[PDB]
Amino acid sequence: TMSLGAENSVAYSNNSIAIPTNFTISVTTEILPVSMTKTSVDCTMYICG
Amino acid sequence: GTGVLTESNKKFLPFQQFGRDIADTTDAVRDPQTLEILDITPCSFGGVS
Ligand SMILES: *[C@@H]1O[C@H](CO)[C@@H](O)[C@H](O)[C@H]1NC(C)=O
Ligand SMILES: *[C@@H]1O[C@H](CO)[C@@H](O)[C@H](O)[C@H]1NC(C)=O
């Protein structure tokens, strides 16, 4: 049976805050399709040769 | 068939008479009189715009 992730009890209380003291610059790659190959068929020549 | 016949660098085994492409199309032949291997190419075609 697959695991959905590690469980994490967030340290919540009505007067506690967490604030980051540092950062990282992250560079992430996103790849997107933009075109197909352009095609045409002479279908007298496909059907009848 | 119909096409343009040309001298080729294909290496047929002695019993083989025809050559085929990935999608079953005949793309070479052996001349049955003088046993050269001929590349077959389609006669030129295209749309007119
Ligand atoms: C912040 O992170 C860098 C490495 O990314 C480290 O060199 C630096 O000491 C860190 N600064 C603090 C305040 O922790
Ligand atoms: C067919 O006859 C020609 C006559 O020039 C000869 O050169 C050739 O070797 C012959 N081929 C076969 C397969 O008998």
Curated annotation (Swiss-Prot), chain B:
Attaches the virion to the cell membrane by interacting with host receptor, initiating the infection. The major receptor is host ACE2. When S2/S2' has been cleaved, binding to the receptor triggers direct fusion at the cell membrane. When S2/S2' has not been cleaved, binding to the receptor results in internalization of the virus by endocytosis using host TFRC and GRM2 and leading to fusion of the virion membrane with the host endosomal membrane. Alternatively, may use NRP1/NRP2 and integrin as entry receptors. Binds to host ACE2. RBD also interacts with the N-linked glycan on 'Asn-90' of ACE2. Cleavage of S generates a polybasic C-terminal sequence on S1 that binds to host Neuropilin-1 (NRP1) and Neuropilin-2 (NRP2) receptors. Interacts with host integrin alpha-5/beta-1 (ITGA5:ITGB1) and with ACE2 in complex with integrin alpha-5/beta-1 (ITGA5:ITGB1). May interact via cytoplasmic c-terminus with M protein. May interact (via N-terminus) with host bilirubin and biliverdin, thereby preventing antibody binding to the SARS-CoV-2 spike NTD via an allosteric mechanism. This is Spike protein S1. It comes from Severe acute respiratory syndrome coronavirus 2 (2019-nCoV). The chain holds residues 548 to 596 of 1273 of the full protein.
